[PDB]
Amino acid sequence: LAIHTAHLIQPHGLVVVLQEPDLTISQISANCTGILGRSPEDLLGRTLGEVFDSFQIDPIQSRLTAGQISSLNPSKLWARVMGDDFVIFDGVFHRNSDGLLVCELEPAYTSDNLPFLGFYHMARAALNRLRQQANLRDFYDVIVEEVRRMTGFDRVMLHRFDENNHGDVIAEDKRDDMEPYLGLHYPESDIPQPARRLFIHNPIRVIPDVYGVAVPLTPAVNPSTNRAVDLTESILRSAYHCHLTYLKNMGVGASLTISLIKDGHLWGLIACHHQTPKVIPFELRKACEFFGRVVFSNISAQEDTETFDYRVQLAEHEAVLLDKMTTAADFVEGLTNHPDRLLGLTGSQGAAICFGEKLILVGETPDEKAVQYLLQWLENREVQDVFFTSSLSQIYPDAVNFKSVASGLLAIPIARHNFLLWFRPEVLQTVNWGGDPELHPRQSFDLWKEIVRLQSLPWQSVEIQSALALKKAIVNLILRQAEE
Amino acid sequence: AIHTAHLIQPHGLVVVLQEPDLTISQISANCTGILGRSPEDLLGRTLGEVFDSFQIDPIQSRLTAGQISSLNPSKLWARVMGDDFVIFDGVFHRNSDGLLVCELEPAYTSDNLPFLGFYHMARAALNRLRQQANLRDFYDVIVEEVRRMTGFDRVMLHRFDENNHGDVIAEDKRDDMEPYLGLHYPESDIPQPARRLFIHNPIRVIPDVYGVAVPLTPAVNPSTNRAVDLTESILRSAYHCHLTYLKNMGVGASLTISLIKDGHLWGLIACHHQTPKVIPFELRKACEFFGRVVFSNISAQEDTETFDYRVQLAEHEAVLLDKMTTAADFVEGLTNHPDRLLGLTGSQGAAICFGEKLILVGETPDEKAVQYLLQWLENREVQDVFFTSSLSQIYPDAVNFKSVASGLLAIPIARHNFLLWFRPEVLQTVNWGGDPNHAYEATQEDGKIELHPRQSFDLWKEIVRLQSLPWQSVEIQSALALKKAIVNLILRQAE
Ligand SMILES: *[C@H](C)[C@H]1/C(=C/c2[nH]c(/C=C3N=C(/C=C4\NC(=O)C(CC)=C4C)C(C)=C\3CCC(=O)O)c(CCC(=O)O)c2C)NC(=O)[C@@H]1C
Ligand SMILES: *[C@H](C)[C@H]1/C(=C/c2[nH]c(/C=C3N=C(/C=C4\NC(=O)C(CC)=C4C)C(C)=C\3CCC(=O)O)c(CCC(=O)O)c2C)NC(=O)[C@@H]1C
């Protein structure tokens, strides 16, 4: 039933389209009858000034309004509705991709005492707590905790993205009684690349009533465009029923989502859920926007420093291996006497050393027969620098059999036939999520699981370079030995 | 300057490899002195032949950047005429022109050095940094720990301001070396080329400042009939202009680490040595990675502090909106909390012309000059808000009170009423005082200080006269908020 071509409006706010240069309402959201007590037929054709009874809005007239909008962007228009209640609205003007003038009106009130300053004071105090954390875990756990405190959502969670753009719920705070989603991985597909790239322009997604019935504009077709309006710019853009389904059968009544953007690419989300509907005012969205920026700034700081700590540990292995490789009469015998360090050098779980005729297996590797066949294959490939794959099963079909040990392989040709190999198993650390058994998280997880079949963790650049460093070091040692 | 005569620092060799045969099309002229074999001898030979090092199996076409990047670095060694057995670090890039280049820095041993020491100190540096309260303390630690890790006679931290003029924000040096801390240099002292180059080439090493630069022979690459672009080289010699600067500064070796945010150069870690001091591939790569994470924490600290301004400005906004409506006169509310009023736009003075009356707060010009100024503002017919970093530039009379109101932010009120904030010229926020008091340097104005820090400071000084600190976005919006509030207090004071 529900069409995918739904650029409609979440029903709590109004969208109006202003004709130029006359500044009359060319189209309006259909909920205007309820919200303004006046029908679309009544309002169609009226200038904004005449609708808002205070004539609050003073749009200085122009043939075209350009960047004058930026001035009007924080506007608090109000008009009397019922018993002279004088309902107020936060107003925000955009130019749609079609090039029309659009104004969005979210009803506002200052009933929430300490509405914005409070949030701001808690936010700085969050940032002090955050910066004083040692562990990155503790660090993440604090983000969600303090966001949830600040915001008051029934659930707040931190989503990061895999190197395949998949998902990983890396932190979470929720009611004791709610189901935990921590560790749940989900497919990249669950948030399509449009919605992602759209977070760059629209950094916050608010759905304060999930069950709210989306309303169109009337007339639906802009007169000038003879084409529908593009709500890409709107906060009130209604979300696609696909996702609402997901939320509904997850038990969600209101969402908030803060994008975490690095250098223009989406790093992760702060995804907030409420079981009850729950509105978030302009004021507090603006503050959330700014908070998420700085929160992410500290995220990327922590993430960066930790990933430099990997480079130290890999240097550590590199050094211990360079030492003991030259100590023991056979260099190979040095490597195999410190296998912890050898596997550690590329963050692998197994390895093989074919030097001349001999061949040594270390850690978790395939049976020697299957390995030998593999080496054979690699010399046929005639790899010049290095071979590495996150999914070996795809390129060497026979490796489907030992997917569980070597789905991932990195191999470096020491010589024409002498090679060094590192093996990774398919992702088995997914135990983090229950795996509990029709489009709901448990399904998404099962789908993600299907995708990661035959597939190891990705070979990080630092790991590869640290293996190349060992290869070149070995070659040089052998040359010196001959020269010796 | 423009001509960019592409020469080489003389300690290392640059070769240009023809493809697909990997023969040397061009070589640096120092090859005679360093390899004991002449350019005539070496030109045409494959690299493998010269350095007894595995010549890459002759590529199907050209060396893919995978093959090029896996090669980096490679240790090449050769015996040459006279028993000479010499080790080089080799490092391959392809030019913007596409041609392949290899640079050979003489090295001490054959086997790799993982810089474990450096890495252990770096790890420990980052723990120190994360535990720092003040941003100053924070910066001061960077330089200190870099200097420890690296062992330079001097390390300093340069941050660029909103026009890219330099500011030496931190520094660690030998006790009896001259301090450059607080020095501000004009953006010109690092030309926009060198800057835009740091985003692609993050590290600059000049281990011999006095070394005589050598060219390639032939100078003209046969494949381009064009001289060769060394932009991508480590061994690219720096322009004599800058070497002069270093020489007259007493430098024997320089290292520089770019600090890049969002693809724009934020600042430098500029390292100086009195003696020559080389930095190997290995240790550059470690430095490169260190500077990234160091900067990552810098931008984290910088960001959080600048959002602390947003909270404090919200705080002023709220207290001012409260007390403005409490006291019967809104003006009387503003003047009872002047700390908060100046604080709202991070200014040092303010003026309130409502109707007839006019109230000066903090540091402002004399009433006569202010009154003339208000007059001027009505003539401007300011629509939303007026703000300028240098008022003296557009209102000439303001040259007189430059030292109080070089910067002005004004919000007009109808009936000729106005709110003003004043900022002083930025000459007292920073007082490096490189010239001894009123040094009579002008006497004997032969530009003797040509290419000298002091000169740069005097140049920068000339640029920043008549000029306040820039009006930050947050500050303007906080003032607009007060404008809207005042308009809505005039409306509610209907009487
Ligand atoms: C439809 C066939 C597919 C689809 C489309 C779709 N998804 C989104 C947006 C989001 N989806 C998620 C996913 C999750 N949120 C959670 O809390 C969890 C459990 C931990 C998951 C898996 C998220 C975070 C978003 C964006 C954030 C938000 O709540 O706004 C959209 C865009 C909707 C819009 O217009 O903003 C679309 C179109 N989702 C599916 O599940 C199908 C595979
Ligand atoms: C020549 C007419 C002008 C000029 C050109 C120029 N400068 C650079 C590079 C740098 N200049 C500096 C400046 C300083 N370094 C310091 O230590 C200090 C004192 C605190 C100053 C003022 C710096 C940091 C650099 C870049 C870092 C480095 O050492 O590499 C270049 C580029 C040289 C190259 O090819 O890499 C050029 C062409 N410099 C002048 O002083 C003239 C105004």
Author numbering:
A (entry chain B): 18 to 454, 468 to 514
B (entry chain A): 19 to 513
Reproduce the article's own wording on this structure.
The underlying structural changes include movement of numerous side chains and sheet-to-helix restructuring of a tongue-like hairpin extension of the PHY-domain. Remarkably, the single substitution of conserved Tyr176 by His in cyanobacterial phytochrome Cph1 increases the fluorescence quantum yield from 2.4 to 14.5%.
In this work, we have addressed both issues on the basis of the crystal structure of the Y176H variant of the Cph1 photosensory module as Pr. Protomer A was modeled contiguously, whereas residues 453–465 (chain B), 73–80 (chain C), and 452–465 (chain D) could not be modeled due to sparse electron densities, probably reflecting local disorder. Whereas the interactions of conserved Arg222 and Arg254 with the B-ring propionate are similar to those of the WT Pr (A-conformation), a drastic change is observed at the Tyr → His mutated 176 site and its neighbor Tyr203, corresponding to the Pfr-characteristic B-conformation. The B-conformation involves concerted changes at Asp185, Leu201, His202, and finally, a “tryptophan swap”,2 where the space occupied by Trp450 in WT Pr is replaced by Trp478 and Phe475 in Y176H. Pfr-like structural features of Y176H also include the interaction between conserved Asp207 of the PASDIP motif and Ser474 of the PRxSF motif. By contrast, WT Pr showed widespread resonance splitting. These results suggest that the overall rigidity of the Pr chromophore in the binding pocket is greatly enhanced by the Y176H mutation. Thus, Y176H represents a mixture of a Pr-like chromophore configuration with a Pfr-like protein structure.
